[PDB]
Amino acid sequence: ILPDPSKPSKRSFIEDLLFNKVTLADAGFIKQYGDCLGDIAARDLICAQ
Amino acid sequence: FELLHAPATVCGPKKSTNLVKNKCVNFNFNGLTGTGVLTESNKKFLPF
Amino acid sequence: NSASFSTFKCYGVSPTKLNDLCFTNVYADSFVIRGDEVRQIAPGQTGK
Amino acid sequence: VVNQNAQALNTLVKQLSSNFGAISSVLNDILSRLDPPEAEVQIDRLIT
Amino acid sequence: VVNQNAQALNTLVKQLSSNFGAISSVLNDILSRLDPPEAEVQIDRLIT
C-alpha cells in the first residue's frame, strides 16, 4: 500500500490495480476525445471544437 | 427532388469562381455545405 | 425571369436556392389540369 | 460513475441527429435550401 | 410518502385531459376530424 519509488509515478502497488479496473474502452465520445492530443498528422486538429 | 443532391451537372449556367487555398470557408462539395479548411486524407475508402 | 410561368411556388426549398445545388436526379412530372384545380396540387390537400 | 457520464454525454451527442419535426437535423442543410423567412420556423424547432 | 407518490401519479394522468392548445385532448378524435397532413401540427402540441 505504500508508494513504490521504483515506478515512475508515486502510485502504490494496489493503486495500480485500481486504475486498471476502470477503463474507457466502452465509450465513444470520451475514448476518441483522448486520441486527439496524440494526433500530429492531422492538420489544424482542434478537438475542443 | 432527392435528399442526396450529390453527383453533378443539374444546376444553373454559372461560371466557376476562385478557391481559398485552405481557408475557413463554407466549402460546398456535391451540394452539401459545411465550415472547415481543406483537410487532405489518405484513408482507403470503398469505391461505392 | 420569364413571364410564361405565372404560378411558380416551391414547397420544400426556396426557389432562389435552386441555383446553389446540382442534382443529377430530378423527377419531372408534366400534365394538364383545369385552372381552378391548380391550388389542389399541393402536399396533402384534399381534392378530386 | 464513468458509465453514467459516458451514456449521458452519448445521449446528448446523439440528440443532434433528431430533427424535432424539422425538415432536417442539420442547420447547414436548412440554411442552404430555405431562405430566412421560413427558415426560422424550421430552425426554431431545432433550438427548442 | 404514500400521498406524494399518489398525487404525483394522479397529477401525471390528469394532464392527459389537457389539450395544450390543441383542438382536443383525446388523441383519437383529432384523427377522426382532421386529415393527416394538417393533423401533424395539432398532434405535435399534445406530444410536446
- Chains in touch with B (≥3 Cβ pairs < 8 A): A, C, D
Interior CA angle at D13 toward D41 and E44, to 5°? Answer: 35
Q: Which residue of D has its CA nearest to A26?
A: D3
Q: Buried (b) or exposed (e) across A11-29, using 16+ Cβ within 10 A?
A: eeeeeeeeeeeeeeeebee
Q: In 3D, which of B43, B32, D2 has the Cα closest to residue A42?
A: B43
Method: cryo-EM
Give, in order, the Cα–Cα distances in Å from E34 to each of A25, D3, E25: 50, 45, 14
3-state secondary structure of A13: helix
Q: Which residues pair with B29 in a beta bridge?
A: B32
Query: Which of chain D's residues have a Cβ under 8 Å away from the Cβ of A20?
Result: none
Residues 6+ apart with CB under 8 A from C22: B5, B7, B8, B9, B10, B11, B30, B31
Query: Hunting for cell 460546398 — which residue is that?
Result: B28
Q: Given in angstroms, what resolution was this structure solved at?
A: 3.2
Instruction: Kindly state whether A47 is in contact with chain D, defined as any CB-CB distance less than 8 angstroms.
Output: no
Instruction: Kindly state whether D40 is in contact with chain C, defined as any CB-CB distance less than 8 angstroms.
Output: no
Query: Hunting for cell 475557413 — which residue is that?
Result: B24
Query: Which of chain B's residues have a Cβ under 8 Å away from the Cβ of C22?
Result: 5, 7-11, 30-31
Contact criterion met (CB below 8 Å) for A12 and A1 = yes
Give CA–CA dist E21/E43, Å, rounded: 10
Residues 6+ apart with CB under 8 A from B4: C25
- CB C20 to CB B8 under 8 A? no
Please name the residue ranges forming H helices in chain B.
none
Instruction: Kindly state whether C45 is in contact with chain E, defined as any CB-CB distance less than 8 angstroms.
Output: yes
Residue A26 φ/ψ, nearest 5 degrees: -85, 65
- CB D13 to CB A29 under 8 A? yes
Q: Which residue of D has its CA nearest to A23?
A: D2
**How deeply is B3 buried, as exposed, middle or buried, from its count of CB atoms within 10 A (0-12, 13-18, 19+)?**
exposed
- CB A27 to CB D2 under 8 A? yes
Residue D41 φ/ψ, nearest 5 degrees: -60, -45
Q: How many CA atoms lie within 13 A of D31 on its CB side?
A: 10
